[PDB]
Ligand binder design. Structure first.
Ligand SMILES: Nc1ncnc2c1ncn2[C@@H]1O[C@H](COP(=O)(O)OP(=O)(O)CP(=O)(O)O)[C@@H](O)[C@H]1O
Ligand SMILES: [Ca+2]
Ligand SMILES: [Ca+2]
Ligand SMILES: [Ca+2]
Ligand code: NA
Length: 994
C-alpha cells in the first residue's frame, strides 16, 4: 500500500478487502504471501573476508612495522652483491609477524560474528494479528505478516512492519522512532490521515514504522508495506553507517600504545647516537655514511623488536573471544565494552518481576467479602489450580470444586478481571500450549476468568484454540467498553469505562472497573461489596482486607497481589478529560471494593546461586521493583538477598520512604539498602545514579519498559530475552537464554580479558626490555656487537608472535572470581609491576651478554679462549702483542652472537611461561595449563632450529649451530628466569596482593 498515511482508515481497509476486527482469511494470506512475499530482508553472510583483513593493518603499531618493512625494501635495491641474500629476508620477517597475527585475528573475528548470527537467528520474532481464523488475536511469526492484515501492538512492543494506525485503544500512543527519524523523545501518534503524500516520516503521525518501539499505549493497525518496502529495509545495506567506536580499555591500551611508541622511538635514536663513532669502521664498510645507514637499521630493528605489534590484535582477539564465549551461553553482546565493563562491576541492580522471577503468572488464590458486622469482617477465600496460562483447573472453596457463579462477589470479580484487561490468551497448535498475549499479570487474570466460567457457559465442545477466550468473550458481550484509562505507575492502577450492551444486560447505568496495587485501590474505596449488596468501608473491613493481602504476600508462596474494585456511579463521560493520565486517579475514586487475587511467580532457578557467587566476587545485588514491599522482602529472602531471619529496617525501602529522606540520605541508602519496592521508573534510574556517584561500575538487569531509564543509565544494562523490545533496545547485552547465571559468567569473562591483557603486556615488556638492556649493556661494557639487523627481526618474530598472542588464551586465574572488583581507579601498570618488569628485563639483558661473553671469557672448550680483558677488541690491529696468538677475526665471529640470539629466544619462551598468571606459581598454575601457548612455544623453538641447522639459513641469518653442550649453557642461563619471577611472585603473594 503506497502512501497509506494519505488515505483514511476505510480507504485502507477496503483497499485490501478486510474487515477491521476480523482480519485476512486463510485464502487471503496464501494469496497475499504470493503477491507480496514474506515480511523480511536478505540475510547477511560472509564470503570474502577481505574487509576483515584491511582492519588488521590499521592500528598505529602495525603501521610502523608496515613502514619498517617498506623502508627495508628501499635498501634492498641499494645493497651490494655479497649479502643481498640477507637484505631481502629482512622485509619478510617484518611481514611474517604481521601476517601471522592478522590470520589469528580475522579468523577469531569470523568465529565470533558467526556464533552471534547463529544466536540472533535462533529465536524467530513474533507478531500479533487478527486473522479471520480466530475470534481473538493470534500470535504468528513476524515474517508471515502481509500488507493487509490487522496488527496489534502495545507498550513495550516492537513494530513488526510499516503499519497504518486504524485505532488507538489507549488515551495516547507514543513511539521510539530514534532508530529511523532520529528524534529522541517519544512521539505522539493519531488515526487521522496526513494529506501530503510527499510528507516526511516525521509527519506521518498515523503510521508505525517497522523496527521502532511503542513507548506507551496500545493500538490496532493495518499493514501498509512489509519486507524490503519498509522505510527501514530500504535503507539497510544502503546505510551500515553505525561507526563502531572503541572500548574504553582499547583506547586505554592504544594510548599505552603511543606511551611506549614515544619511549621506544627514543631509545632507538638513543642508539644511532651512542654509535656515531662507529659509522666509520673496517667492519661496517668504511664510508662516512655507509656506517650510519647500518646503525639506522639497528635502531629500526630494535624498534620493530620493541614495539608490541601483537597488542592491537590480541585485544581485538580477546574481545571476539568474549562475544563468542558469551554467544555460546545464549547471551547476545550488543556492545563490545560489555564483558570488559562487567568485569569491573561492583553492584548489580536488578528488576524483580520477570527478571529475578519467571513471569509465569497464575492466580492461585482469590477472595471477596463474605460478611460485615461491627468490628467483624469475614472473607470468602478460594483456591485455583493449574500453573500455566491454560484454561484448565478448578476453583476450590473448601477443598471442594466450586461453581464460581454461585457467589455474586465472584461474578463481579471475574467481570472486572475480564473487562479491565488489555491482554488475551492464544493457543499454540505447534507447541500444544496456551501462550499469553500482552502482560503476564494480565493474562493470568484472563486464564482465571476462563477457569471461573461464571455464567456456566458450554465450553466442553470447543477446540483448544476457542476454549482460550470463550468465557472472557461472554463477559465482554455483556458490557460495552467505552474507553480505557490505561495503566500508569504513579497511580499503580488501571480502569475501564463500561455501559450495558443491549437495552438490557444489567441496565443499572454506567460503570468503571478498576484494578491495581492493593494499597492505592483500597484507599480509594468508600464501600466494600457483599454479594450484590454494598456497605461503607470501615477501619475493621480495611484492616481485614489488608491483613490477608499481607499474609499471602509475605507468606511461603510470596504471592503478587492485586485489588479489584468498581466505581458504581462514574462521572459523566463528558466531565472526563482523557489527555492527562494524572487526572485518571481521581476518576478512580469512590470505589467499591470487590476482591483480591494473589498470583504466583516463582523465582528463577539460578538466581539464588548466582547472587551467592556475586557476593563472593565482591558484587552487590539490589532488588528494584514496583511490587509491594512485602512481597519484595519476602522474595529477597527466598533468593538469598536477605538472610531468612535478618532485620531489614535500614535495608528495604518503598519509593515513598525513599523520597522522604533528604537527598544525601537517599544516596547513602543505596549503599546499604538491597531492596526497593513500589518504586517508579524514575526511581530505578535514580538508585543506579546514586550508586554511580560513589564512582562504582553499575549494571542493571530488567525486562520491563519501566527498566529502560535504569538500563541506559547503568554502565552496562542486561535485558531478558523474554522481555520487551524497549528494554532490549536500552541494553548493552540480552540474555536470550533468560539465564541469570550468564551475568556472572560475563563478569568472570571480563576479568579474564583484563588479566590476559596484563600477562600479554607483562610478557612483551619484561622481554623486549631485556632486549634493549642487552644492547645498551653491550655498548657500555665495550664488548663487541651482540646482534645484527635480521638477528633482531628474527628474535622479534619468534618472541613477539604466536607465543605472545596465545597469552590471550590464558585461562581464568585461580581466584579471579574470589577477589573484589578492580577499582576503576587502579592504574594499568602498577608501581610494583614496573619493578617486576625491570627486575626480569634486567636479568635477560645481562643473561644474553653473559652468554656471548662466555664464548670469549670463560669460553669452556669453545674455539677462542680470550679470557680476562675482553672489553678491548678494537685494539687488535694496533696492539696484537696483548693477545697470545689470537686471530683478530674471532671478534667478527658469528659464534658468540649465535650463543646470544639463542639465549634470547630461549629465555623468552621461558618467560612466557611466567605469563600464565600474574601472582600464581608455575607449579600452582602448570605450564601445560594453556596448551595453545605450548604449541606456540614449540612452533617458535623449532622455527629457530631451522635457522641453526638448515644450510642456506645459518648463512643468511649469519649464525652457526651449537654443540649439544652449549645448549646446556643456553638453558643453564635461561631456565633460572623462572626462579626469579617465582620469587617476585612469592613476594607479591605474601605482601602485596591486589
Ligand atoms: N496492567 C496492570 N493493570 C493494573 N495494575 C497493574 C498492571 N500491571 C501492574 N500493576 C500493578 O502496578 C504495580 C506497579 O507496577 P510496576 O510495573 O511499577 O511494578 P511490577 O510489580 O509490575 C514489575 P517489576 O517487579 O518488574 O518492577 C504492581 O505492583 C501491580 O500491583
Ligand atoms: Ca616486537
Ligand atoms: Ca518486569
Ligand atoms: Ca621479544
Ligand atoms: Na549504558
Amino acid at each position: 500500500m503506497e502512501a497509506a498515511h494519505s488515505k483514511s482508515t476505510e480507504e485502507c481497509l477496503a483497499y485490501f478487502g478486510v474487515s477491521e476486527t476480523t482480519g485476512l482469511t486463510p485464502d487471503q494470506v496464501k494469496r497475499h504471501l504470493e503477491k507480496y512475499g514474506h515480511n523480511e530482508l536478505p540475510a547477511e553472510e560472509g564470503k570474502s573476508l577481505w574487509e576483515l583483513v584491511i582492519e588488521q593493518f590499521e592500528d598505529l603499531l602495525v603501521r610502523i612495522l608496515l613502514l619498517a618493512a617498506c623502508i627495508s625494501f628501499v635498501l634492498a635495491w641499494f645493497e651490494e652483491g655479497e649479502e643481498t641474500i640477507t637484505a631481502f629476508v629482512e622485509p619478510f620477517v617484518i611481514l611474517l609477524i604481521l601476517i601471522a597475527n592478522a590470520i589469528v585475528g580475522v579468523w577469531q573475528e569470523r568465529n565470533a560474528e558467526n556464533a552471534i548470527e547463529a544466536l540472533k537467528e535462533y529465536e524467530p520474532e513474533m507478531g500479533k494479528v487478527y486473522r479471520a481464523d480466530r475470534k481473538s488475536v493470534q500470535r504468528i511469526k513476524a515474517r508471515d505478516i502481509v500488507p493487509g492484515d490487522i496488527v496489534e501492538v502495545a507498550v513495550g512492543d516492537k513494530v513488526p512492519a510499516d503499519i497504518r494506525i486504524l485505532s488507538i485503544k489507549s488515551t495516547t500512543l507514543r513511539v521510539d522512532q530514534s532508530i529511523l527519524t532520529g528524534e529522541s523523545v517519544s512521539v505522539i501518534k493519531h488515526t487521522e490521515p496526513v494529506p501530503d503524500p510527499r510528507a516526511v516520516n516525521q509527519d506521518k503521525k498515523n503510521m508505525l514504522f517497522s523496527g521502532t518501539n511503542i513507548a506507551a499505549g496500545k493500538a490496532l493497525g493495518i499493514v501498509a508495506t512489509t519486507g524490503v518496502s519498509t522505510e527501514i529495509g530500504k535503507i539497510r545495506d544502503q546505510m551500515a553507517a553505525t561507526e563502531q567506536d572503541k572500548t574504553p580499555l582499547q583506547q586505554k591500551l592504544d594510548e599505552f600504545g603511543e606511551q611506549l611508541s614515544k619511549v621506544i622511538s627514543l631509545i632507538c635514536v638513543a642508539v644511532w647516537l651512542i654509535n656515531i663513532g662507529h659509522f666509520n669502521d673496517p667492519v661496517h664498510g668504511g664510508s662516512w655514511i655507509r656506517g650510519a645507514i647500518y646503525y639506522f637499521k639497528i635502531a629500526v630493528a630494535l624498534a620493530v623488536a620493541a614495539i608490541p605489534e601483537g597488542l592491537p590484535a590480541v585485544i581485538t582477539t580477546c574481545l571476539a573471544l568474549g562475544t563468542r564465549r558469551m554467544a555460546k551461553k545464549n547471551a547476545i553482546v550488543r556492545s563490545l565494552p560489555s564483558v570488559e565493563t562487567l568485569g569491573c562491576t561492583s553492584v548489580i541492580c536488578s528488576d524483580k518481576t520477570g527478571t529475578l522471577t519467571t513471569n509465569q503468572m497464575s492466580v492461585c488464590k482469590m477472595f471477596i467479602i463474605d460478611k460485615v458486622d461491627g468490628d467483624f469482617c469475614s472473607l470468602n477465600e478460594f483456591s485455583i489450580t493449574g500453573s500455566t496460562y491454560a484454561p484448565e483447573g478448578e476453583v476450590l472453596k473448601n477443598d471442594k470444586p466450586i461453581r464460581s457463579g454461585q457467589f455474586d462477589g465472584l461474578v463481579e470479580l471475574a467481570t472486572i478481571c475480564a473487562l479491565c484487561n488489555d491482554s488475551s490468551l492464544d493457543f499454540n497448535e505447534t507447541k500444544g500450549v496456551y501462550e499469553k498475549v500482552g502482560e503476564a499479570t494480565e493474562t493470568a487474570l484472563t486464564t482465571l476468568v476462563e477457569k471461573m466460567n461464571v455464567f456456566n457457559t458450554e465450553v466442553r465442545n470447543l477446540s483448544k484454540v476457542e476454549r482460550a477466550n470463550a468465557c472472557n468473550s461472554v463477559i465482554r458481550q455483556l458490557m460495552k467498553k467505552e474507553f480505557t484509562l490505561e495503566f500508569s505507575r504513579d497511580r499503580k492502577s488501571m480502569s475501564v469505562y463500561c455501559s450495558p450492551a443491549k437495552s438490557s444486560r444489567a441496565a443499572v447505568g454506567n460503570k468503571m472497573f478498576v484494578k491495581g496495587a492493593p494499597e492505592g485501590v483500597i484507599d480509594r474505596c468508600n464501600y466494600v461489596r457483599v454479594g450484590t449488596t454494598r456497605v461503607p468501608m470501615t477501619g475493621p473491613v480495611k484492616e481485614k482486607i489488608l491483613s490477608v493481602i499481607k499474609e499471602w504476600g509475605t507468606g511461603r508462596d510470596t504471592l503478587r497481589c492485586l485489588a479489584l474494585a468498581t466505581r458504581d456511579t462514574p462521572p459523566k463521560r463528558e466531565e472526563m478529560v482523557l489527555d492527562d493520565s494524572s487526572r485518571f486517579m481521581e476518576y478512580e475514586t469512590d470505589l467499591t471494593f470487590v476482591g483480591v487475587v494473589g498470583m504466583l511467580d516463582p523465582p528463577r532457578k539460578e538466581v539464588m546461586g548466582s547472587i551467592q557467587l556475586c557476593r563472593d566476587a565482591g558484587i552487590r545485588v539490589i532488588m528494584i521493583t514496583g511490587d509491594n514491599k512485602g512481597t519484595a522482602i519476602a522474595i529477597c529472602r527466598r533468593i538469598g538477598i536477605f538472610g531468612e531471619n535478618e532485620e531489614v529496617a535500614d535495608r528495604a525501602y518503598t519509593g515513598r520512604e525513599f523520597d522522604d529522606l533528604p537527598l544525601a540520605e537517599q544516596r547513602e541508602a543505596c549503599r546499604r539498602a538491597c531492596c526497593f519496592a513500589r518504586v517508579e521508573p524514575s526511581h530505578k534510574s535514580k538508585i543506579v545514579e546514586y550508586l554511580q556517584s560513589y564512582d562504582e561500575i553499575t549494571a542493571m538487569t530488567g525486562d520491563g519498559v519501566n527498566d529502560a531509564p535504569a538500563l541506559k543509565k547503568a554502565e552496562i544494562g542486561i535485558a531478558m530475552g523474554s522481555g520487551t523490545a524497549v528494554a532490549k533496545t536500552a541494553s548493552e547485552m540480552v540474555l536470550a537464554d533468560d539465564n541469570f547465571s550468564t551475568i556472572v559468567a560475563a563478569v568472570e569473562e571480563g576479568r579474564a580479558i583484563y588479566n590476559n591483557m596484563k600477562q600479554f603486556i607483562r610478557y612483551l615488556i619484561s622481554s623486549n626490555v631485556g632486549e634493549v638492556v642487552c644492547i645498551f649493556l653491550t655498548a657500555a661494557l665495550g664488548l663487541p656487537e651482540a646482534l645484527i639487523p635480521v638477528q633482531l627481526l628474527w628474535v622479534n618474530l619468534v618472541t613477539d608472535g604466536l607465543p605472545a598472542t596465545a597469552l590471550g588464551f590464558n585461562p581464568p586465574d585461580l581466584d579471579i572470581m574470589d577477589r573484589p572488583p578492580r577499582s576503576p581507579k587502579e592504574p594499568l601498570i602498577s608501581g610494583w609491576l614496573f619493578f617486576r618488569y625491570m627486575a626480569i628485563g634486567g636479568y635477560v639483558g645481562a643473561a644474553t651478554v653473559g652468554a656471548a661473553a662466555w664464548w670469549f671469557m670463560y669460553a669452556e672448550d669453545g674455539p677462542g679462549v680470550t679470557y680476562h680483558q675482553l672489553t678491548h677488541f678494537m685494539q687488535c690491529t694496533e696492539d696484537h702483542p696483548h693477545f697470545e696468538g689470537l686471530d683478530c677475526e674471532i671478534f667478527e665471529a658469528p659464534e658468540p652472537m649465535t650463543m646470544a640470539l639463542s639465549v634470547l629466544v630461549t629465555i623468552e619462551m621461558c618467560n612466557a611461561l611466567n605469563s600464565l598468571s600474574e601472582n600464581q606459581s608455575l607449579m600452582r598454575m602448570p605450564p601445560w595449563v594453556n596448551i595453545w601457548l605450548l604449541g606456540s612455544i614449540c612452533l617458535s623453538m623449532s622455527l629457530h632450529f631451522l635457522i641453526l641447522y638448515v644450510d642456506p639459513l645459518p648463512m643468511i641469518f649469519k649464525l652457526k649451530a651449537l654443540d649439544l653442550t652449549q645448549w646446556l649453557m643456553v638453558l643453564k642461563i635461561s631456565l633460572p628466569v623462572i626462579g626469579l619471577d617465582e620469587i617476585l611472585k612469592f613476594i607479591a603473594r605474601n605482601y602485596l596482593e591486589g
